[PDB]
């Protein structure tokens, strides 16, 4: 782009635009549990102790 | 003692996803179904429903 500067010369707009955009943000995940005993050693007694 | 016979004998075993040829003198119950249940399969044991 070219951009002239200039002393004593202004820009000034003449007329306008009305915009919308959209912003998308996270804010939340998903909740996650564990059961560790059923993880490791799930059904053992032996493995439990 | 060191010098004399012995007789040896190497047994080999295999525990594959296959029927079973060879087995143990364990005795064999009724199924029970829709229990948490300890069960053995051709050896292979574990809890479950």
């Given at each position: 782009s070219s951009i002239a500067y200039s002393n004593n010369t202004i820009a000034?707009?003449?007329?306008?635009?009305?915009?919308?955009?959209?912003?998308?943000?996270?804010?939340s995940?998903?909740?996650?549990?564990?059961?560790?005993?059923?993880?490791?050693?799930?059904d053992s007694t032996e493995c439990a102790n | 003692v060191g010098h004399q016979p012995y007789r040896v004998v190497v047994l080999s075993f295999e525990l594959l996803n296959?029927?079973?040829?060879?087995?143990?003198?364990?005795?064999?119950?009724?199924?029970?179904?829709?229990?948490?249940?300890?069960f053995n399969f051709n050896g292979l044991t574990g809890t479950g429903v």
């Open positions: 000034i707009p003449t007329n306008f635009s009305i915009s919308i955009t959209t912003e998308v943000m996270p804010v995940m998903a909740k996650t549990s564990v059961d560790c005993n059923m993880y490791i050693c799930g | 296959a029927p079973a040829t060879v087995c143990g003198p364990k005795l064999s119950t009724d199924l029970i179904k829709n229990q948490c249940v300890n």
